Write an enzyme that holds these catalytic residues in place. Sequence first.
Site, short mmCIF file in Angstrom:
data_model
loop_
_atom_site.label_atom_id
_atom_site.label_comp_id
_atom_site.label_asym_id
_atom_site.label_seq_id
_atom_site.Cartn_x
_atom_site.Cartn_y
_atom_site.Cartn_z
N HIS A 61 0.81 -1.22 0.00
CA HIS A 61 0.00 0.00 0.00
C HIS A 61 0.84 1.26 0.00
CE1 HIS A 61 -3.19 -2.83 1.05
NE2 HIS A 61 -2.57 -3.13 2.18
N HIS A 91 5.30 7.24 6.66
CA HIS A 91 5.01 6.77 5.31
C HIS A 91 4.46 7.96 4.55
CE1 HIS A 91 1.22 6.47 7.53
NE2 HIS A 91 0.71 6.87 6.37
N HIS A 93 1.82 9.26 1.06
CA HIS A 93 0.80 9.03 0.04
C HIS A 93 1.15 9.91 -1.14
CE1 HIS A 93 -1.83 7.14 3.16
NE2 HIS A 93 -1.16 7.97 3.94
N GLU A 103 -3.55 13.62 0.76
CA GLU A 103 -4.83 13.20 1.34
C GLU A 103 -5.61 14.41 1.86
OE1 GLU A 103 -3.87 9.73 3.87
OE2 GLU A 103 -4.61 8.66 2.11
N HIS A 116 3.20 11.30 6.49
CA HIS A 116 2.54 11.06 7.79
C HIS A 116 3.57 10.47 8.75
CE1 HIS A 116 -1.62 10.82 5.68
NE2 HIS A 116 -1.19 12.04 5.91
N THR A 195 -6.08 6.96 7.75
CA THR A 195 -6.62 7.11 6.40
C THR A 195 -6.58 5.82 5.58
OG1 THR A 195 -4.56 7.83 5.32
CG2 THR A 195 -5.90 9.55 6.40
N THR A 196 -6.10 4.74 6.17
CA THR A 196 -6.17 3.42 5.57
C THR A 196 -6.90 2.48 6.52
OG1 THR A 196 -4.01 2.85 6.55
CG2 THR A 196 -4.03 3.64 4.31
#
EC number: 4.2.1.1
Length: 257
Positions: A61, A91, A93, A103, A116, A195-196
Site C-alpha cells: 500500500h 510513510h 501518500h 490526502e 505522515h 486514512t487506511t
Amino acid sequence: HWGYGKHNGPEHWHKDFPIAKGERQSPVDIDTHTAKYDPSLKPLSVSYDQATSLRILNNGHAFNVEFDDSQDKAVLKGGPLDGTYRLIQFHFHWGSLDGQGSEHTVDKKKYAAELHLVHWNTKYGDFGKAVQQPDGLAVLGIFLKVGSAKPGLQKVVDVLDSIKTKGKSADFTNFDPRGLLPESLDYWTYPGSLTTPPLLECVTWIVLKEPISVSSEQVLKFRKLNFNGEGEPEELMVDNWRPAQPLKNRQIKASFK
Ligand SMILES: S=c1[nH]c2ccccc2s1
Ligand SMILES: [Zn+2]
C-alpha cells in the site's frame, strides 16, 4: 483485500470497515477561512534528535520507515496534545502525476504527496493499546510539492530500489526524520482517523501549513514502487491516497493568527 483500485479502493472500504462512514474520518479538506486560531494551543514540540530508525518495508500500500519506539527517543508534544506521543513510523501518500497525491487538501488544493509521521500516546503503553483510544495517536502531516530537491529525503529515495514489491523489507538505520521538516511549525489540527483500513478514529491530526519541496526525480522514484508482490503482474504504486471525507461539523483549529 483492500487497496486503491476500482474494485477495492476507497469507495469499497466501508464494506469490510464500516467505520469508513463514521463521524471522524480522515482526511478532510482544510477550509483555511473557516479554521479558527486557538490561543489555548500550547507550542508544538518535535523532538527527533534521538530517533532510531530500524527498517523500511513495502506493505503493498505504501512504504513504512519504522523506528525503535521502546524508549522515549523521538517524541511529539505540545500543541493540542496532552502529554507525550512517541514516533513509531512514517510513510507517504502520492499521486500518479504532480497535481494529485495528498490526502488532506487546503482550500481544495491537492499537493503532489503527503508525509505522515505516526506517534502513539505514551499513556497507553504501546501502539496496539493506543489504537483502542480516542486520543491514542497523533499524526504529523506534511505536504510535498515538486520543485527543488529535499536532500534529507534522498536516503529514502535511494533505498526504494531494494523494496520494489509487496512484502520486501530492508535494513534502514540512522535515518534522521528532522531532514523532512519544513522551516515553520504553523499547523492546523482536528480529530480524525487513520486514512487506511482499519480507519480507526484515534488520531489527533496536526497538519503543517508549510509544504516541503521535493524534486521531480525524487517523486518519480516513489512512483516506480509496486503494489503487487515479486513475480506478479506489475501495478505501479501510485495514487495511494484516500480523498477528503465529510467534516461532520468537527472544528479545525489553527495554531497561527
Ligand atoms: S495516516 C495513518 N495510516 C496508518 C496505518 C497503520 C498505523 C498507523 C497509521 S496512521
Ligand atoms: Zn497515512
